[PDB]
Design a binder for this molecule. Structure first.
Ligand SMILES: Nc1nc2c(ncn2[C@@H]2O[C@H](COP(=O)(O)OP(=O)(O)CP(=O)(O)O)[C@@H](O)[C@H]2O)c(=O)[nH]1
Ligand SMILES: [Mg+2]
Ligand SMILES: [Mg+2]
Ligand SMILES: [Mg+2]
Ligand SMILES: [Mg+2]
Ligand SMILES: [Mg+2]
Ligand SMILES: [Mg+2]
Ligand SMILES: [Mg+2]
Ligand SMILES: [Mg+2]
Ligand SMILES: [Mg+2]
Ligand SMILES: [Mg+2]
Ligand SMILES: [Mg+2]
Ligand SMILES: [Mg+2]
Ligand SMILES: [Mg+2]
Ligand SMILES: [Mg+2]
Ligand SMILES: [Mg+2]
Lengths: 85, 122, 689, 62
RNA sequence: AAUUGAAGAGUUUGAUCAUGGCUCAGAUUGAACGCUGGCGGCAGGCCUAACACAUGCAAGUCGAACGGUAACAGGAAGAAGCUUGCUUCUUUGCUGACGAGUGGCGGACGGGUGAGUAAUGUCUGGGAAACUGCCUGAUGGAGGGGGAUAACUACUGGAAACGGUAGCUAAUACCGCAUAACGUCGCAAGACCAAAGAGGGGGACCUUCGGGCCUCUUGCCAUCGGAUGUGCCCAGAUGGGAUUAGCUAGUAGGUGGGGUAACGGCUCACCUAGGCGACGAUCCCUAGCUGGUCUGAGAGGAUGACCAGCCACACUGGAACUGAGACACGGUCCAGACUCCUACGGGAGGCAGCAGUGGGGAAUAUUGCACAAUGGGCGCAAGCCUGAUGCAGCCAUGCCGCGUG
RNA sequence: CCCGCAGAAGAAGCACCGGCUAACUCCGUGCCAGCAGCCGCGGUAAUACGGAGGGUGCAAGCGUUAAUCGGAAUUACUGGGC
């Protein structure tokens, strides 16, 4: 509507698209880790875990995931990666 | 092709919903109406709010027929349904104020201009 | 605040017979004034293609030759027709100038006659424009001659036409003696101010030399030099004729073809040239409040105490009530609190709008000699004066044409009944020439207007603007009943030997008819009782008894009228007889007496006065006769012929419409109740409920 | 609903617009309202002088 | 000192007493109508249609984040008609400043409304598992690189709303890399995470003579605190109905995954067969709650306008995105009802913001003024924005004075 | 808000007066026209209808209606009954 704080709309669209691809990727690494967990491949798990940790940790700082989610993920995944692996 | 009996879907607000043809105007022994001819109507359905009501009797323009329409070159446009727009008995002219579904360029008459201005297509 | 032009104000109204072009020409103006918007914008008036309500715009004319210091013209295009004449009474009371249009083919014609009389009624200065010069049968001078003969006026052709019908190319300013040439495209504008052609030199070498001589007759010293063959200067002629135009002793004629664009423009010039300013005009008459006269006067002055008249009331869906006015004197600023003198209530001005050709522009101030619409004013009807509260005055108020046609309307769907009451009410306050009332007897809604068409578009306005459709019929009639023969001693009796109060009554009377005597009564009760055959205390009830049946007689309901009754004989029991017992006997006495008295059905007759041209007093006379009507005189009133007749009401319905047809549209008439007379048998037996 | 028309004389007929006041009449059972003289189409009582506020009669020009 | 204050009368009967209804005197009102009408002060003013809405206004602001010049001014990489230091054209972003654009903060506040909500709310009182912009106390960071893009430019589509291809560019936009604890995960060993610059002035010294360099003011990252705000949990109290008595499958619990800022059937699979109800479940009907307001001696009854707190809603149904905060009154998407513009191909919109119109009604206001004060948004600030607010207009609607001698 | 200036000058209504209920007469009218919160006024001396004079009560307001509580111990916990 005819109020130049409509540029806000066009900005937040750029934002979604940004957040879109990053948060997509982040998730697809958290996907990879569980893949091992399900496969049983004890090595691949730590491989990816240690591969996703930097992503997840950064994304908390970037503020598109904010702190305790990053915490929780690697937290309970640790609690799973060494429950037989 | 519409003929007496025949249910039409209605393609405007007005409230009609399902409407039956009780005559085909335009000639002695005229058999079918289609394309964009006019027909005499009886209201079988009607909305609660409604401009028109059940048992009302009006006219209508056929705007969509399942047998469709030709145009030169040879092409054909068919629509899945049979649809008309309710017209005031005396002045023709849509009684509704919105159209729904496509209409065809054949309707490009003087008196049906209002129809094609509304209507989101062809 | 400041304002700008002032005194260069041209308040003119265009009006004429139907067609003529008195709206085409109005739009043409707007084009020419508006170098660098149809006045028929009503829905109904676009469908039908006719002016129904007077349409006001303002626009600025710089003068076609560039010649002029720019003037501000307030134009008002009005209806032709009749039916809505009110839209000219008002549209002629208020403004200063008037441009009478005429068809090059249709001469004067009946409704030119009416708007003419209305120009005189308010003594409004005027010029003239003969349009449609391009049409088959065009003849400029013929119309000129007709203005003189048919309207008994003093025309002065300020111009001359270059040919006629399909060969109509331009005009001759017979002051500046040049044949103005309007060109091809650009519709108007341009000129090349060409000189007279060889064809017309002899005619052109007239002017009606009694133009310069009609310019002469302005003042004698203005002609003394004319007498000495001194050619008067162009400037002192324009001043001269204008002087006399401004004095309604002369009418300049201009001609043109708005369709071909060859003409409208010269006429605009001619407006400022010869039509008044708001100051070349008599200051207004009026009264003070409780007190007496003094004309309100109120000189056309910005620095006088404010005073304006309310003509025309409307309602726009988005801004609410519009109330048009003409400011004669003083000034109103947005927020002033003026007084409605004729209602003894004050109003507070708020928003103000000037209809400006094609845009409702907003204004904060409105000076004298200007017109406008005030938004939001609460209780301002048409004809009211809006003056200064400290310097209070009633103004003259034009006249209200008074209806000629009446009709009963019922609201088709019983629900709408309420809504009718409202809408008829609204349309009423807008249009004072329309009226509505409820028949005091036979309770049906009745509307009345200035004609068949008038009523038509009123009803039509109900549907369109209030979604009330209602169908229409001929009003019912208030019949009466009486007896013909004086009937001798008829016996009404009671005797109630039942189970309680005795109750016996016996009365013998004569029910004799009367003549339309004593206004209130129409009913005579004689106590011609014997010595004391009935006590004088039971004599008030027998009277009361009879009183009861007179309300709806035995023939077909309807009031019983012109009756006399005499007491002669009766009897009682020393107790059993009673207040009631004789009242009932009277009831029985009224019947039988009534059955045997040869009853008859009365109908109401009108005293009808038709005013008509000498040409067809025969047809009118005859129709009156045809309507079962009785004639009683003819006077021969000056120019028409007052025709007097007694004709039954139930037969005068829709009279106006045919009278019009019989008399080319020139024929007033009037009626009021006179008496009740015997209805012809066929009538009576029909009137059966 | 039915409503009383107090005061001497009145107009009022088939299509009049009026204003209902509330107030019964211990003589007309089922009549539980008064008509308010002088509001809308209902004219005031003619020539009334005492208690004109009721019966909607304006002060007779002192 | 301080909630210290309770009246009866008329009417049933021939008369009486009792019973018992109806009625009246009091106070109060966001009132209306009728008659009448002088002023002022303070206050109140759509109780109905949460009905539809023309028009204007109600959210902007930073050039001290960035490329910048279209306009406005001055200064001009400097000039005429000559009116020789007064001008108005043509050039220059120089400086003031500033249209559009990227960016930033705000748009989640302020203001409206009472539809929904009988307990997903509210009031009182408790509680543990949470996040929190701006403002703040404290500790350290503020290294070095990289890929893009609006604007712009060349073509090009529309009636308009909007744009379409191609090419180029800046940053406190964006993304690696380095750095990495009193931070996150971990028993530990260990793993792993960030960011940004910009201005005012200036001795030397130095200079592609732009600056470097010094200094001062701001801004950026990180963490633990504080403050304010919010989320979540329990208990009691918060209308009428039994001519509503049964209700309940993610139902009630457990386990384990997932999930959120956070606890939790919040979610999912499996397992137990539970959970609620006459101390009123369920189902119907009505309703925003409280502080309080009116009445009353009190206890009670009645009530929830104006002020303030809390909740909910933003044409209707639904949905997420952005973000510290929304599932967003003047944002987005989808559907609906409706209206409006169209050059008929297509487009646009939601006054329960202020003012105002139509409509409903017994009934309720001006399309006013100003940011001067108070206060909010951005800004270093000046300032700009601010229909919050401060005032004025209209109506005896109220309360209080005063007059009309 | 202050001080000047003119001149009583620009500024009084509404309800009520049978009992409850503060305030009485004439006249018109005659179970009519009408009044009325309740009882009840009106069918020839009407303090009750309508006008008038007089009076009582309020006063820039007065009435009427609508509405809540009171009176109502008439839902009675306080504080009633069969
Ligand atoms: N041939 C021709 N026709 C003309 C000319 N001027 C006007 N007309 C026609 O007359 C017809 C009616 O014109 P119009 O302006 O409506 O006249 P009017 O005065 O408004 C009729 P009303 O009385 O209802 O207002 C139009 O068709 C118009 O074109 C003309 O100069 N030539
Ligand atoms: Mg997010
Ligand atoms: Mg109205
Ligand atoms: Mg800028
Ligand atoms: Mg509700
Ligand atoms: Mg790193
Ligand atoms: Mg678990
Ligand atoms: Mg878990
Ligand atoms: Mg009690
Ligand atoms: Mg919504
Ligand atoms: Mg909005
Ligand atoms: Mg007394
Ligand atoms: Mg008497
Ligand atoms: Mg009396
Ligand atoms: Mg009590
Ligand atoms: Mg009891």
């Amino acid at each position: 509507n005819i109020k130049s704080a409509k540029k806000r709309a066009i900005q937040s669209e750029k934002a979604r698209k940004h957040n879109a691809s990053r948060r997509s990727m982040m998730r697809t690494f958290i996907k990879k880790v569980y893949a091992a967990i399900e496969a049983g491949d004890k090595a691949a798990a730590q491989k990816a875990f240690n591969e996703m940790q930097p992503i997840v940790d950064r994304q908390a700082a970037k503020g598109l995931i904010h702190k305790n989610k990053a915490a929780r993920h690697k937290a309970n995944l640790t609690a799973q990666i060494n429950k037989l692996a | 092709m519409i003929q007496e009996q025949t249910m039409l879907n209605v393609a405007d607000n007005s409230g009609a919903r399902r409407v039956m043809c009780i005559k085909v105007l335009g000639g002695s022994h005229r058999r079918y109406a289609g394309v964009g001819d006019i027909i005499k109507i009886t209201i079988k359905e009607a909305i609660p709010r409604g401009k028109v009501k059940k048992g009302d009797v009006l006219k209508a323009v056929v705007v969509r027929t399942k047998k469709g329409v030709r145009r030169p070159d040879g092409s054909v446009i068919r629509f899945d349904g049979n649809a008309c727009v309710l017209l005031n008995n005396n002045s023709e002219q849509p009684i509704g104020t919105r159209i729904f579904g496509p209409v065809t360029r054949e309707l490009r008459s003087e008196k049906f201009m209002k129809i094609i201005s509304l209507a989101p297509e062809v | 605040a400041r304002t700008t032009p002032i005194a260069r104000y041209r308040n003119i109204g265009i009006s004429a017979h139907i067609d003529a072009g008195k709206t085409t020409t109005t739009e043409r103006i707007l084009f020419y004034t508006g170098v660098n918007a149809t006045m028929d914008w009503m829905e109904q008036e676009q469908e039908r293609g006719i002016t129904i309500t007077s349409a006001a715009t303002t626009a600025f004319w710089s003068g076609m030759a560039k010649q002029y210091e720019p003037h501000r013209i307030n134009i008002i295009d009005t209806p032709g027709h009749v039916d809505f004449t009110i839209e000219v009474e008002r549209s002629m009371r208020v403004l200063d100038g008037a441009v009478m249009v005429y068809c090059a083919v249709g001469g004067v014609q009946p409704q030119s006659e009416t708007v003419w009389r209305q120009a005189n009624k308010y003594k409004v200065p005027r010029i003239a424009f003969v349009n449609k010069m391009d049409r088959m049968g065009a003849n400029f001078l013929k119309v000129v001659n007709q203005i003189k003969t048919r309207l008994g006026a003093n025309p002065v052709p300020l111009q001359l036409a270059i040919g006629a019908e399909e060969h109509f190319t331009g005009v001759v300013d017979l002051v500046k003696m040049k044949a103005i040439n309007w060109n091809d495209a650009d519709q108007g504008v341009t000129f090349e101010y060409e000189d007279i052609p060889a064809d017309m030199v002899e005619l052109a070498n007239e002017w009606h030399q009694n133009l310069i001589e009609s310019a002469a007759e302005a003042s004698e010293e203005l002609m003394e030099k004319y007498l000495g063959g001194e050619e008067l200067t162009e400037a002192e002629i324009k001043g001269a004729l204008r002087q006399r135009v401004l004095n309604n002793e002369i009418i300049l004629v201009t001609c043109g073809s708005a369709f071909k664009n060859k003409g409208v423009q010269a006429m605009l010039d001619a407006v400022i040239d010869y039509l008044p300013s708001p100051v070349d005009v008599p200051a207004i008459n009026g009264i003070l409040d409780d007190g007496k006269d003094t004309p309100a006067e109120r000189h056309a002055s910005d620095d006088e105490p404010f005073s304006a008249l309310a003509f025309k009331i409307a309602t726009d869906p988005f801004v609410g009530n519009l109330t048009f006015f003409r400011v004669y004197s003083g000034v109103v600023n947005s927020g002033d609190t003026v007084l409605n003198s004729v209602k003894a209530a004050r109003e507070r001005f708020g928003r103000i709008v000037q209809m400006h050709a094609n845009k409702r522009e907003e204004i904060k101030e409105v000076r004298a000699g200007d017109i406008a619409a005030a938004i939001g004013l609460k209780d301002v009807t048409t004809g009211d004066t809006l003056c200064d509260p400290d310097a209070p005055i009633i103004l003259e108020r034009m006249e209200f044409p008074e209806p000629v046609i009446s009709i009963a309307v019922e609201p088709k769907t019983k629900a709408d009944q309420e809504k009718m009451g409202l809408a008829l009410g609204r349309l009423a306050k807008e249009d004072p020439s329309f009226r509505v009332w409820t028949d005091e007897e036979s309770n049906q809604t009745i509307i009345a207007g200035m004609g068949e068409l008038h009523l038509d578009i009123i009803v039509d306005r109900m549907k369109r603007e209030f979604n009330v459709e209602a169908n229409v019929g001929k009003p019912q009639v208030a019949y009466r009943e009486t007896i013909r023969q004086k009937v001798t001693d008829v016996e009404g009796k009671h005797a109630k030997q039942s189970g309680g109060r005795g109750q016996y009554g016996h009365v013998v009377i004569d029910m004799y008819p009367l003549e339309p005597g004593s206004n209130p009564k129409g009913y005579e009760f004689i106590n011609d009782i014997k010595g004391g055959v009935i006590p004088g205390e039971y004599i008030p009830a027998v009277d009361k008894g009879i009183q009861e049946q007179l309300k709806a007689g035995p023939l077909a309901g309807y009031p019983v009228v012109d009756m006399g009754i005499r007491l002669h004989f009766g009897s009682y029991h020393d107790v059993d007889s009673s207040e009631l017992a004789f009242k009932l006997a009277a009831s029985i006495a009224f019947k039988e007496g009534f059955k045997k008295a040869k009853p008859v059905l009365l109908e109401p007759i009108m005293k009808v006065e038709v005013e008509t041209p000498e040409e067809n007093t025969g047809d009118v006379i005859g129709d009156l006769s045809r309507r079962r009507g009785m004639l009683k005189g003819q006077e021969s009133e000056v120019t028409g012929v007052k025709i007097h007749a007694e004709v039954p009401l139930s037969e005068m319905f829709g009279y106006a419409t045919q009278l019009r047809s019989l008399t080319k549209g020139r024929a007033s008439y009037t009626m009021e109740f006179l008496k009740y007379d015997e209805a012809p048998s066929n009538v009576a037996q029909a009137v059966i409920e | 609903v039915t409503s009383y028309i107090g005061g001497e004389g009145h107009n009022l007929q088939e299509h009049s617009v009026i204003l209902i006041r509330g107030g019964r009449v211990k003589d007309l059972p089922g009549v539980r309202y008064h008509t308010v003289r002088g509001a809308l189409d209902c004219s005031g009582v003619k020539d009334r002088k005492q208690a004109r506020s009721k019966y909607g009669v304006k002060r007779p020009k002192a």
